[PDB]
């Protein structure tokens, strides 16, 4: 009588197939609007910043605000070089996926700026704990495409000896920690790696990565807690692309909140940054890195971007969101935006663009030819079956010895 019946509440994306998304839910800010706090700023004094948007490049491509200071155009160039290489590589692999040359692939269309951006702000020795979607990091550190593709193929030449699903890369020399299909686990692992660096009086930092969806996983909260408790030199990266397969970020707990907000909550200085503004990505990443390396503490950055492509090759986004959704995303295309800016200040041109595209297209095609020379799905040219039992333990134990012998 007195109380109306309670109702379960289930969040829904404003946009469904056959409609138009209402991108109002993204609390956005104009370029240069957000301030640049000191590297020693207390976590508590970062609250506003967790609910706003650090962004440099405006609508017309001009840089605004304090985040625009001290930005070497040579770095932006490497950035442009990194994003394009990534995107082109991505395109290529999707195709080799259709033509049944590759088992499985995940794109990073629309997110190329983030990994590359941060990668360029870090040292090669600063180990990254990436998800399956930060191949841009590998690209910005100029990793052999041949070996990347070989892994994508499970060749006789796969560095992981075909033990691991395509894209689940591992490149210790590139400061790129072995990817695991299990979500979120790497976020805690990053914090531990930083704790180690701190324990040995080193100066290396950990770069941790996670998506919007995976923040709901328990290792997310474990990472923030440990990063905070021990003041570990970690950069904690949340990549909010609005989606987790078919699931809108509101079901991840984004409704009326921010992911950056959860860092402030556990006493970690937090930024929410335009994920498609390369300059902003670079500027925010440098800040966090410097904060960490100075020994002033961990940082949480929520990168606001959009998962423009399919979740994976097995995915069909047209079954749960508007097909033309990316067209309307207020933060546009990272490559497009950097391009406009880089031309307008005179360190880029349609010419260098077209050429750089052309050279990377060539580079991937070559490496793909180079890698396939060592096998395919179709070719039984794959790693040995006897290798299947190695590295399970340091020394092949008796029982695996029998199991290999029996083959």
């Amino acid at each position: 009588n007195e109380y109306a019946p309670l109702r379960l509440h289930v969040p829904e994306p404003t946009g469904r197939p056959g409609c138009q998304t209402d991108f109002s839910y993204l609390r956005l800010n104009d370029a240069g609007q957000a301030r640049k706090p000191p590297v020693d700023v207390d976590a508590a004094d970062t609250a506003d910043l967790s609910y706003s948007l650090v962004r440099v490049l405006d609508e017309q491509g001009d840089a605004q605000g304090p985040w625009a200071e001290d930005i070497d155009p040579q770095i932006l160039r490497q950035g442009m070089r990194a994003m394009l290489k990534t995107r082109i590589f991505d395109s290529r692999m999707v195709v080799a996926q259709r033509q049944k040359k590759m088992s499985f692939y995940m794109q990073s269309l629309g997110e190329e700026a983030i990994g590359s951006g941060q990668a360029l702000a870090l040292n090669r020795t600063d180990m990254c704990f990436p998800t399956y979607r930060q191949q841009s990091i590998l690209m910005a550190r100029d990793v052999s495409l041949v070996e990347m593709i070989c892994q994508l193929l499970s060749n006789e030449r796969d560095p992981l000896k075909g033990r691991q699903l395509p894209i689940m890369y591992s490149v210790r020399e590139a400061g790129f920690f072995t990817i695991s299909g299990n979500l979120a686990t790497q976020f805690v692992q990053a914090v531990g790696w930083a704790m180690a660096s701190a324990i040995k009086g080193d100066t290396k930092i950990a770069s941790a990565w996670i998506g919007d969806g995976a923040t709901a996983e328990s290792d997310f909260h474990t990472a923030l807690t440990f990063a905070h408790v021990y003041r570990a030199p970690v950069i904690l990266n949340v990549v909010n692309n609005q989606w987790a397969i078919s699931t809108f970020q509101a079901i991840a707990g984004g409704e009326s909140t921010t992911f950056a907000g959860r860092g402030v909550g556990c006493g970690i200085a937090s930024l929410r940054v335009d994920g498609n503004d390369f300059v902003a990505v670079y500027a925010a990443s440098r800040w966090a890195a410097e904060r960490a390396r100075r020994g002033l503490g961990p940082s949480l950055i929520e990168w606001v971007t959009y998962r423009a492509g399919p979740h994976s090759t097995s995915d069909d986004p047209s079954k749960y969101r508007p097909a033309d959704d990316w067209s309307h995303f207020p933060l546009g295309d990272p490559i497009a935006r950097l391009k406009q800016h880089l031309i307008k200040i005179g360190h880029w041109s349609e010419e260098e663009h077209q050429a750089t595209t052309a050279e990377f297209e060539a580079a991937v095609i070559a490496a793909q030819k180079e890698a396939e020379q060592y096998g395919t799905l179709a070719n039984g040219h794959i790693p040995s079956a006897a290798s299947m039992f190695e590295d399970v333990y340091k020394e092949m134990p008796d029982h695996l010895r029998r199991q290999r012998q029996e083959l």
Partner: protein, 338 residues
Amino acid sequence: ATTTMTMIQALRSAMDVMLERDDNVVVYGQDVGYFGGVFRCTEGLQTKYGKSRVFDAPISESGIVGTAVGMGAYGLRPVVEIQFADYFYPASDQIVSEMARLRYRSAGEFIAPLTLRMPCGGGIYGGQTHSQSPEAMFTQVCGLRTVMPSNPYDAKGLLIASIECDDPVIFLEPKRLYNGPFDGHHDRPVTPWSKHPHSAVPDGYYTVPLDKAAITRPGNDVSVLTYGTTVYVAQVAAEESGVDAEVIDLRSLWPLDLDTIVESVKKTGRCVVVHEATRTCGFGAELVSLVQEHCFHHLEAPIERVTGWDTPYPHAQEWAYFPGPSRVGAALKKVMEV
């Protein structure tokens, strides 16, 4: 009446039936709602019953299982999903420490009539985290009940039965068998369910009794204890070996149909255990131990077991890992040897 269904459509039907039968039944999990699941297994359900009954969940396995435990304590009947069996681990605590022991530790005051569907099994180039068989992680938990179907008919019936059971059920689904049966021959492209026995699925309500195994191929030479994808592997392998092997689909892993098993080996005099799961401390060892305990004198040879290697599920070496008709076949010859 009846309709020809795939495993996917059968499981979906089971949930549609029970969703209708019992007001307290609720279905949730990752991508389960609007999208209808990354495997179609829940298509249309939300449209039909409303978000309050079928809904999308955050990516949190312990959250999913944990809330379900609370929902059960209130008096609902949660049928909850975990996208891949390989990702149950974060829910381990809620599963072993809470769901399994809720009835025991409260002297029946609170119960957990939950069902956890987890797609399992390999043979699909899944790799390390898209294809493991963690049934031994559950069978060892007192208070749990582990079940795995091998065909659409049993898939619907065992699922309905499972949801209705007042004990917590780990419902393992072999994704290899989702679209059609699979014998381990990747050379021969796979046929759909419509061209096979047991795709004839009743539209309405029905059950397949728990704790009751099924003799797939009656034989006299060897008893073959198996379940899931390896059922069809054992069948084809029995035909290729020539060996007149009796193929038993346990259907209910644990608790199991002990009598049907003992009866087969008692007649036969030899048995081979087959499962995708890794060898050491897998479910096969309990099966071997059980047979040995109850069929020792009637045993004409050592109990063999053809399983996956003690190694994480690889990608490229897929068919060298998965226990196929050849590797199973060899064991059928090996047991029949004097």
